[PDB]
Design a protein around this ligand. Structure first.
Ligand code: HEM
Length: 473
């Protein structure tokens, strides 16, 4: 509607009694009926607004300031991408930042504002790492995921069911080592334990804001009130560090050229691969498998046809970037997975000055220093942007629908924009889109269709294969 019809109003909501309310609120957030989605929906209903004040976890001792302004609609949300208006310093994980003792004593790239020289240096370093792996991406993905599928197939044939997540995570890390460093981590001292080592380390970092499914009387006192001692995970972290220090030589050498010490470079590479990359794929691949599986054989047949046809005609028998460009449905399927279920839901930004923001029916004033918070899942399901927003529509982005990519924000920026040293958009944006398309491609080069069953998991979606129809033999 016309902005002149959106009156300037006070931001609804209150923070309540300082120490007390944030604790009561995090209890609602983690144990209230409906979970965090209801935490946000109930407030939207209560205040009849997609913009409101609220306290956010972790609260008290871990976080010195739980107060934020929540943004749930597609009109207000984009302010979080505007680095000229919002500061993005030490807020990668929200209203608190994990101890730097968990990251070699350094404040790694993800926590740096673009105004910091190191942000440009380190992000350029990661761009180098990504470009350097370009020639290995497709071949190594094919090799790694063929191994994964052969394994799942064998498990299914012998047991009747095959859980995806675990072996899928092992495959993800195996692929990353091969693509980024031309190294199979399973041949090193890491063996097949990388996923377990990483998960433990990530837990130490994020425990304050993670719901592990434990009862409140156990989870609150031991995970949500105090930070877990960093010296306890040092041993585990060192195993990971030793791996990267030995295989990331070319990236470490480029780091020196950019003015970054080798040690700092390794800690940042470790973080980018284990935290950013692995953690994201651990969530995205199972979710994508889920949405495609729930779509039915009709979609499966169309994807198989498109994928195999493009490979034969444009790839001359092989998977090439040129071939992928000619797979419109596959591209849309991946974008729809990223829209309907953003792998990383929370984005934060702190106001650098006083300015105005607007929802679909009101105008609000934001004061310098206030923490803005956006819950992406609600914003990318805004009915004023997407028809049937709660439904997975496979071809939503095909043809004219491509214009809607301006509203796909999984990477902390419009899908149409590229990450740069000037913004805080995911450095590996194009890489994740490519590998997720490769995941779908490898799946349909081998199978005509598949069936799954879903389980109740805390960190994402638990997917189990119940049937795999082979394309040949
Ligand atoms: C599909 C998997 C991935 C997802 C869902 C994802 C998501 C995100 C999100 C939401 C942010 C913004 C965080 C914030 O400031 O609030 C981000 C930042 C970032 N991501 Fe990713 N990411 C993925 C894969 C990767 C990969 C593979 C790399 C590369 C090694 C990467 C590197 C980065 C970096 C370096 C930043 C911070 C950039 C900066 O400080 O400007 N990401 N990612």
């Amino acid at each position: 509607m016309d902005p002149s019809s959106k009156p300037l109003r006070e931001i609804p909501g209150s923070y309540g009694i300082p120490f007390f309310q944030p604790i009561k609120d995090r209890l609602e957030y983690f144990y209230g009926t409906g979970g965090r989605d209801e935490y946000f929906r109930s407030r939207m209903q209560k205040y009849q607004s997609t913009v409101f004040r609220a306290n956010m976890p972790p609260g008290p001792f871990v976080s010195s300031n739980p107060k934020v302004i929540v943004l749930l609609d597609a009109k207000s949300f984009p302010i979080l991408f505007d680095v000229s208006k919002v500061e993005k310093k030490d807020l990668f994980t929200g209203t608190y930042m994990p101890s730097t003792k968990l990251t070699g004593g350094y404040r790694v790239l993800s926590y740096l504002d673009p105004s910091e020289p190191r942000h440009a240096q380190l992000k350029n370093l990661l761009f180098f790492m990504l470009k350097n792996s370009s020639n290995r991406v497709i071949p190594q993905f094919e090799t790694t995921y063929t191994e994964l599928f052969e394994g799942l197939e064998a498990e299914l044939a012998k047991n009747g069911k095959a859980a995806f997540n675990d072996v899928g995570e092992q495959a993800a890390f195996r692929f990353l080592g091969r693509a980024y460093f031309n190294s199979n981590p399973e041949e090193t001292k890491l063996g097949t334990s990388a996923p377990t080592l990483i998960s433990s380390w990530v837990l130490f970092n994020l425990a304050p804001t993670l719901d592990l499914g434990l009862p409140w009387f156990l989870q609150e006192p031991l995970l949500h009130t105090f930070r877990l001692p960093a010296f306890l995970i040092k041993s585990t972290y060192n195993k990971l560090y030793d791996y990267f220090q030995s295989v990331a030589t070319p990236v470490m050498e480029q780091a020196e050229k950019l003015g970054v010490p080798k040690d700092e470079a390794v800690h940042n590479i470790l973080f980018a691969v284990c935290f950013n990359t692995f953690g994201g794929v651990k969530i995205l691949f199972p979710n994508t498998l889920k949405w495609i599986g729930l779509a039915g054989e009709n979609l499966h047949t169309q994807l198989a046809e498109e994928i195999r046809g493009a490979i034969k005609s444009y790839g001359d028998g092989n998977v090439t970037l040129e071939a992928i460009e000619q797979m419109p449905l596959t591209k849309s399927v991946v974008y729809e997975s990223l829209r309907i279920e953003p792998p990383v839901p929370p984005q934060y930004g702190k106001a650098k000055s006083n300015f105005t923001i607007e929802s679909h029916d009101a105008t609000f004033e934001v004061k310098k220093g206030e923490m803005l918070f956006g819950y992406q899942p609600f914003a990318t399901k805004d009915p004023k942007v997407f028809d049937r927003p709660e439904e997975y529509v496979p071809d939503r982005f095909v043809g004219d629908g491509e214009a809607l990519l301006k509203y796909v924000w999984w990477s902390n920026g419009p899908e149409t924009e590229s990450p740069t040293v000037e913004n805080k958009q995911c450095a590996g944006k194009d890489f994740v889109v490519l590998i997720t398309r490769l995941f779908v491609i490898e799946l349909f080069r081998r199978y005509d269709s598949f069936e799954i069953e879903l389980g109740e998991s805390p960190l994402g979606a638990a997917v189990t294969l119940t049937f795999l129809k082979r394309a040949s033999i």
